């Protein structure tokens, strides 16, 4: 791949689309000012789906020269317009008129069907041309570093909304067509063409103002203004929080966001009309969830963040992608977390994208965050969970390292020297560091240029008023020790914390050596010390014992914050899955976690346990372990009990349903009985129960119930209303334990009843249900293999039924046996998933082999 000659670059587009409904094509003529920087008989641009009419280059005050040469490479999008006579270098105006078509791949310019108040089904032309795919609106130099502005013009019908970038400047009627009228718009400023946008369209809106004083509306479908309500309020705080905090004022005299019905990009940040879809952006107050209102928050921030961040400063080529998703995907969490602090939104972070990057950095076949990008194609390959995730999350910990004051200084000097413009990776570091007098480019090498994260392993001795820290790096795998002697290593920010100040660190540092040593002064033995504050930085921690017992008090009274909480028992199970640390260790830190109110800790505390429970399936004291649960679960689910207590919160009644489920499955007595009291009264019509303990007592009265319990749910299915209650039901359908129950849950799952994209959630269901069902889950899957591997080969949902039904193996012996079955009985879209669930039964096969009796001895010593 080679970019284009740019021997002749743009200077400004001026565009005149006319989108031709029902016919979903379009016609437009382009007249592109541009500068031939260089002598040269033909112009390269980027083209597809386009056909041109006619195309000629008139230089300053001459008369233009058709183009006699035309040549069409659609396996580059690339078009050579010929021409007889050199250029020559100067000013010119290229004129190009074409046609296109309104396609229906969801990319460049294409039709977006829609439902009117009634119906009928009509057609909507809306646009989406990242990455390159506004060549297929119009031929232009689609490359993020060939910057120009645009002129945008629109010939909509009269009951029709024309929106762009810019706001409407005229609107004067076309002559040809009475019913049309041509829409132009105002001049946008230098900017990048997959940041383009136009969308004709019916829509209302709903419009305010914000302090700064930009004109902000939402738009939403007909007959849903109301719905954009919440999104407007928070797009009209948004714009002041970044003013502020980028010292920078909205670059755009209006801001727009529209919801789309089913916009299959989900959401886009075009610069001043960021497209949305409506199951996003708007709130159905009779269709909408709790936490809805805080996905809203945190999408509107993310792409707002853009308009400073990527479209203001554009990345200078798609290897640097990474930094402009990463940074907007770690500020939208200091944007909501600033406007809601009772979100407590970095807690929900450090669960998400944290951890899942933590998860994938430390297994096989990883690679850095910044990989050098070819082909634009390139990109969709080798960008995924790592290079987002963990590209937010080693931005949180450079602002951490880098301190709010000097962050805020070296955005404020990296947006103004480089607006309207283009900067790379390094240009960013660059600036940080003026700002920071700090390392930042050769710390952010280690974090970028390679792939995998450091364990920093610490150990104390109390030297007088003073603690001793010994510190340690090395490569964390979730196998064990890494085995390779590249010994790679990293250079890690590390904030220091104790008891004596628990919320604001007591000492920051750079690690960059293998091993160093650290004096915390005045630090009493009483006194515990915490590694990682706010769970900032991406590294696990391994804490001596003396040093872990000193944390059971600050679990235990809850002066260690809750995201530092929520790390500490992550990395402590994750430790002793790898063979670091032993499973009893991390067993007794349980029972400090009694006290525990926060729904996003017990969230990650239910899941760890969760895998362990079913781990100990395969041994003969799996009583002991559901004991052990129970009495971890007990304390929480007698506070929150089962019916919501005057002015509970909405993660309340979350934890409320996760508790009781836990309690239920693990055969709480108390929650079992209560349990059949709320189903037999929801089954008789007495007193139909909330949708927020529906899930949890269908698992409960189903796992301790018979064949009358079953029947009563495919009963409660197949006379399920709506489809939402049906999902409810096959999920937790798989909770049966008796054989021949089993077996007619798999039997629904491939009926009628049953749509096929939902198949496989019964099924996964019946896998995590037990351990012998999910050995009847894995015998179900190979005998009806030839209806299934028909039903969804090469799809999503075949690497999903692989990953539900086998990772649940702990017998390395069956690690060996599910390989064996996929080269008899192939599945070559699953190639990537089957690698990954073998090598998480061998991890889960020698855990369990290396801590079962140890486990064991230790659940008979704690009840005595
Ligand atoms: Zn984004």
Redesign the pocket.
């Known amino acids: 791949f080679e970019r284009l000659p740019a021997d002749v670059s743009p200077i400004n587009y001026s565009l005149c689309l006319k989108p031709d409904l029902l016919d979903f094509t379009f016609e437009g003529k382009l007249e592109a000012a541009a500068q031939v920087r260089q002598a040269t008989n033909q112009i390269v641009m980027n083209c597809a789906d386009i056909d041109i009419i006619t195309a000629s280059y008139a230089p300053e005050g001459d008369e233009e020269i058709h183009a006699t040469g035309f040549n069409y490479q659609n396996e580059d999008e690339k078009v050579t317009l010929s021409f007889p006579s050199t250029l020559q270098t100067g000013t010119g105006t290229l004129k190009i008129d074409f046609v296109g078509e309104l396609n229906d791949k969801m990319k460049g310019f294409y039709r977006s069907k829609y439902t009117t108040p009634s119906g009928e089904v009509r057609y909507a032309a809306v646009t989406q041309f990242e990455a390159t795919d506004a060549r297929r609106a119009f031929p232009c130099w689609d490359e993020p570093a060939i910057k120009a502005t645009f002129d945008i013009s629109l010939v909509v019908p009269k009951d029709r909304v024309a929106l762009s970038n810019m706001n409407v400047i005229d609107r004067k009627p076309y002559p040809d067509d009475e019913n049309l009228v041509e829409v132009k718009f105002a001049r946008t400023p230098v900017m990048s063409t997959y940041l383009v946008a136009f969308v004709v369209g019916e829509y209302d809106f709903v419009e305010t103002r914000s302090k700064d004083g930009v004109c902000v509306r939402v738009y939403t479908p007909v007959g849903k203004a109301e719905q954009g309500k919440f999104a407007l309020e928070v797009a009209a705080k948004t714009l002041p929080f970044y003013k502020d905090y980028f010292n920078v004022p909205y670059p755009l005299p209006k801001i727009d966001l529209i919801a789309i019905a089913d916009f299959a990009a989900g959401?886009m940040?075009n610069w001043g009309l960021v497209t949305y879809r409506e199951t996003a952006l708007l709130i159905d107050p009779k269709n909408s969830c709790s936490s809805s209102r805080q996905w809203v928050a945190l999408v509107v921030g993310?792409?707002l963040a853009?308009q400073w961040f990527?479209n203001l400063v554009t990345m200078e080529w798609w290897t640097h992608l990474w930094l402009?998703?990463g940074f907007?995907?770690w500020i939208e969490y200091l944007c909501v977390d600033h406007c809601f602090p009772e979100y407590d939104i970095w807690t929900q972070f450090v669960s998400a994208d944290y951890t899942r990057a933590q998860e994938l950095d430390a297994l096989d076949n990883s690679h850095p965050i910044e990989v050098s990008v070819g082909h634009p194609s390139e990109v969709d390959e080798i960008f995924d969970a790592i290079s987002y995730s963990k590209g937010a999350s080693v931005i949180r910990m450079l602002h951490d390292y880098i301190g709010d004051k000097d962050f805020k200084k070296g955005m404020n000097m990296y947006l103004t020297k480089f607006q309207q413009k283009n900067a790379a990776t390094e240009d960013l570091w660059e600036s940080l560091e003026n700002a920071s007098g700090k390392p930042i480019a050769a710390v952010m090498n280690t974090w970028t240029k390679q792939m995998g994260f450091p364990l920093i392993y610490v150990e104390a001795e109390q030297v007088e008023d003073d603690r001793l820290l010994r510190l340690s790096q090395k490569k964390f795998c979730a196998g064990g020790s890494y085995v390779g002697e590249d010994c790679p290593q990293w250079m890690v920010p590390i904030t220091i914390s104790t008891s004596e100040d628990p919320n604001q660190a007591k000492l920051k540092i750079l690690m960059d050596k293998p091993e160093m040593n650290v004096v915390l002064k005045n630090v009493k033995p009483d006194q515990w010390v915490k590694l990682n504050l706010g769970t900032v930085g991406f590294y696990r921690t391994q804490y001596s014992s003396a040093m872990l017992e000193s944390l059971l008090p600050g679990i235990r009274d809850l002066s260690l914050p809750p995201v530092d909480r929520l790390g500490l028992q992550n990395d402590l199970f994750s430790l002793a899955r790898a063979g670091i640390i032993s499973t009893v260790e991390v067993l007794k830190v349980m029972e400090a976690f009694v006290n525990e109110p926060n729904y996003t800790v017990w969230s990650d505390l239910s899941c760890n346990l969760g895998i362990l429970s079913t781990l100990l399936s395969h041994t003969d004291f799996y009583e002991e372990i559901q004991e052990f649960v129970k009495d971890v679960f007990s304390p929480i689910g007698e506070r929150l009990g089962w019916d919501p207590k005057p002015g509970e919160g909405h993660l309340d009644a979350l934890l409320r349903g996760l508790v009781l489920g836990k309690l239920g499955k693990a055969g709480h007595k108390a929650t079992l009985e209560e349990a059949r009291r709320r189903f037999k009264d929801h089954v008789e019509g007495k007193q139909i129960l909330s949708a927020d303990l529906r899930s949890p007592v269908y698992l409960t009265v189903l796992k301790h119930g018979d064949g009358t319990t079953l029947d009563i749910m495919l009963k409660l299915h197949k006379q399920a209303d709506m489809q939402e209650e049906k999902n409810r039901i096959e999920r937790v359908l798989g909770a049966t334990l008796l054989p021949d129950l089993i077996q007619k849950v798999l039997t629904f799952a491939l009926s009628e009843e049953v749509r096929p994209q939902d198949t496989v959630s019964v099924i996964g269901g019946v896998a995590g249900g037990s351990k012998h069902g999910r050995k009847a889950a894995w015998k179900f899957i190979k005998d009806n293999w030839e209806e299934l591997y028909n039903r969804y080969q090469g799809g999503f949902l075949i690497s999903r039924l692989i990953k539900l039904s086998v990772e649940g193996f702990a017998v390395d012996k069956m690690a060996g046996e599910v390989k064996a079955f996929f080269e008899s009985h192939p599945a070559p879209s699953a190639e990537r998933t089957i690698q990954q669930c073998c090598e998480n039964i061998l991890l889960n096969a020698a855990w369990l082999k290396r801590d079962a009796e140890s486990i064991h001895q230790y659940l008979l010593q704690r009840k005595a």
């Open positions: 959401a940040e993310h792409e853009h990527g402009n998703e907007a995907s």
